[PDB]
Design an enzyme around this catalytic site. Structure first.
Site, PDB file in Angstrom:
ATOM      1  N   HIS A  96      32.972  53.805  12.576  1.00  0.00           N
ATOM      2  CA  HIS A  96      33.896  54.033  11.473  1.00  0.00           C
ATOM      3  C   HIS A  96      34.875  52.893  11.241  1.00  0.00           C
ATOM      4  CE1 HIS A  96      32.234  57.972  10.808  1.00  0.00           C
ATOM      5  NE2 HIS A  96      32.098  58.023  12.120  1.00  0.00           N
ATOM      6  N   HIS A 243      24.896  55.468  20.683  1.00  0.00           N
ATOM      7  CA  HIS A 243      25.741  55.217  19.522  1.00  0.00           C
ATOM      8  C   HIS A 243      26.347  53.817  19.526  1.00  0.00           C
ATOM      9  CE1 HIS A 243      28.479  55.988  16.253  1.00  0.00           C
ATOM     10  NE2 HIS A 243      29.558  56.089  17.007  1.00  0.00           N
TER      11      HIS A 243
END
Length: 264
Positions: A96, A243
């Site tokens: 993000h 991730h």
């Protein structure tokens, strides 16, 4: 590690390399710092001047800061790059952090920012399980629960020592204040734009974007469709367990960044 005061707040950063051309500028995600890029850094600095940037409140000074979000992340790093007399540059943003990377791309234009690489950022609208966790980390009483549950799915049973050490040992000294703020900012980002793909189509003069990921699972096909509609967009699934592709596969991700810059 060096610091500057940008927009009245303390920005920690790293400045390495002198090759000419666009500067790599690394941007981490929430609740971690420029050490997210320790693995990639030897390859990046061999290629270009490389500036690793921390967010406000993420440097060595862990006092709680005034509330901030994507607009401040962007203005801080821009103000930092202006102070460092960095001209054209290429953000590399983890998850993000890509929201700020895109805000930075949108603010300065395609000539000052000719490319952007994004690492493992949810490209669909926010799943409801995700939004549920974005509210759980805003929960004073159970924010730690939320984090452990996000972390466990980020690991996905990995054995990669670098990713394990980074999550377990290298992201200390944050708490409810920063995790709740990440919940607030990520939630409001999907709520405002729908998705980062929608965010990209709103760029007045889109530069070259590449999304590199190992975690979404749904669809590469959503990416194929997006790439087929916009020639400035590329992507690559990496096949990592985690991730954190930049940490799990640092040479491959660096090679991608060097490739992206070469094209643009």
């Amino acid at each position: 590690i060096t610091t500057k005061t940008v927009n009245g707040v303390q920005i920690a950063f790293d400045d390495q390399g002198h090759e000419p051309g666009p500067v790599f500028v690394t941007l981490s995600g929430w609740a971690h710092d420029l050490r997210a890029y320790d693995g990639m850094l030897p390859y990046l600095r061999a290629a270009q001047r490389t500036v690793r940037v921390c967010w406000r409140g993420h440097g060595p000074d862990r006092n709680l800061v005034g509330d901030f979000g994507i607009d401040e992340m962007a203005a801080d790093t821009i103000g930092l790059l202006d102070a460092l007399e960095v001209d054209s540059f290429v953000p590399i943003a983890h998850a993000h952090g890509g929201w700020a990377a895109l805000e930075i791309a949108d603010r300065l234009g395609a000539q000052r920012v000719p490319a952007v690489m994004i690492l493992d950022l949810i490209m669909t609208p926010a799943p409801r399980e995700f939004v549920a966790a974005l509210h759980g980390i805003q929960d004073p009483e159970r924010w730690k629960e939320g984090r452990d549950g996000l972390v466990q799915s980020w690991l996905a049973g990995t054995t990669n020592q670098a990713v394990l050490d980074h999550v377990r040992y290298d992201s200390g000294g944050h708490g409810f204040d920063m995790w709740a703020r990440a919940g607030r900012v990520i939630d409001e980002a999907y709520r405002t734009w729908g998705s980062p793909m929608r965010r990209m189509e709103a760029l007045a003069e889109p530069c070259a974007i590449r999304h590199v990921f190992s975690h979404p699972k749904e669809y590469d096909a959503l990416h194929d469709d997006f790439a087929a509609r916009h020639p400035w967009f590329s992507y690559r699934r990496l096949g990592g367990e985690t991730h954190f592709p930049g940490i799990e596969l640092p040479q491959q991700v660096a090679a991608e960044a060097i490739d992206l810059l070469a094209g643009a």
